[PDB]
Design a protein around this ligand. Structure first.
Ligand code: 4WA
Ligand code: ZN
Length: 257
C-alpha cells in the first residue's frame, strides 16, 4: 500500500489516487514575493481553551494526537473561513535530516518539520462528511526549525517510546495544543488538499509565517518512530512528507503587509 519509500512513495500515489494530479493539490511552495495581502481576510481566531485531547496513535505514516470533537471545544474561525471548524487531530511531517521535512516550502526553503492541526467544518456534522466537501477542512500548518526546545512539545516527545510501531496507541489526556503555537498568527492561505492519500481537495490551508523552534533532541525522538508494526523489520519513520505540487490556477493570499 502507499507510503514514502522508493516503490510506494509520492510519485506512485496517482495510480491508486488519480486526484494526485488534480487542480488543487497540496503542499505547495509559497513564493513570498508573489503572495498578495488580502484586506477581505477577517481576523483569525484560534480558540483552544477547552481542548480535550484523548489519545496518541502511530498510524504507520505519522502519529496523531486525537481530540474529543463531539462539542465546540477547540475551534478555528475567522481568516479565510466561513463558520466554525473543530479541531479533530494534529500530527507532524519531518525529515531524516534537519534540512528537510516540511511539506510546504517558503521561497523553496524546507523546514525540519511541519505541524498540521486538522479541523472540520461543523456545517457538515462529522469529519468523514466534511472531507468530501470543497470547504470541508481547515488545516493550520506551522513550521518547525531546530534551535531552542519547545516546552509545550515535550509531553508529546516523551510518550513516543510507548507508540514506537504502527497500530500502537496510548492515553494522551490533558494536552494543551496552545503550547505548540508561535507568537504571531500572520499567515498565508490557499485552497488545497490532503497531503496524503486519499488526497481529497477539501482543505483550506492556513500556513503560519512564524516557525516554532524545537530542539535537536526533540526532533531526534520523532526519528526513532517506526513505519512498521511490532515484530517487523525496522523502517525508521522519517521523511514522511510530500514534496511541493504544482500551484496551477491558484493565488496564495497573505494576512499581513
Ligand atoms: N476517510 C478518511 C481517510 C483518510 C483521511 N485522511 N485525513 C487527512 C488528515 C489530514 C491530512 S494533512 N496531511 O494534514 O493534509 C491528510 C489526511 C480522512 C478521511
Ligand atoms: Zn499533514
Amino acid at each position: 500500500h502507499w507510503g514514502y519509500g522508493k516503490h510506494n512513495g509520492p510519485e506512485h500515489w496517482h495510480k491508486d489516487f488519480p486526484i494526485a494530479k488534480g487542480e488543487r493539490q497540496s503542499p505547495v511552495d509559497i513564493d513570498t514575493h508573489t503572495a498578495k495581502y488580502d484586506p477581505s481576510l477577517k481576523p483569525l481566531s484560534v480558540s483552544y481553551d477547552q481542548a480535550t485531547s484523548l489519545r496518541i496513535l502511530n498510524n504507520g505514516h505519522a502519529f496523531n494526537v486525537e481530540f474529543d470533537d463531539s462539542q465546540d471545544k477547540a475551534v478555528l474561525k475567522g481568516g479565510p473561513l466561513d463558520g466554525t471548524y473543530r479541531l479533530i487531530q494534529f500530527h507532524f511531517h519531518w525529515g531524516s535530516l534537519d534540512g528537510q521535512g516540511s511539506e510546504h516550502t517558503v521561497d523553496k526553503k524546507k523546514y525540519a518539520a511541519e505541524l498540521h492541526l486538522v479541523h472540520w467544518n461543523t456545517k457538515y456534522g462529522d469529519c468523514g462528511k466534511a472531507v468530501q466537501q470543497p470547504d470541508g477542512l481547515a488545516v493550520l500548518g506551522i513550521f518547525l526549525k531546530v534551535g531552542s526546545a519547545k516546552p509545550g512539545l515535550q509531553k508529546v516527545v516523551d510518550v513516543l517510546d510507548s507508540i514506537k510501531t504502527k497500530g500502537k496507541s496510548a492515553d494522551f489526556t490533558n494536552f494543551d495544543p496552545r503550547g505548540l503555537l508561535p507568537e504571531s498568527l500572520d499567515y498565508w492561505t490557499y485552497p488545497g488538499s490532503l497531503t496524503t492519500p486519499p488526497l481529497l481537495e477539501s482543505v483550506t490551508w492556513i500556513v503560519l509565517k512564524e516557525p516554532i523552534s524545537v530542539s535537536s533532541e526533540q526532533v531526534l525522538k520523532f526519528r526513532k518512530l517506526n513505519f512498521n508494526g511490532e515484530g517487523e523489520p525496522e523502517e525508521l519513520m522519517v521523511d514522511n512528507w510530500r514534496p511541493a505540487q504544482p500551484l496551477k490556477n491558484r493565488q496564495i493570499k497573505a494576512s499581513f503587509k
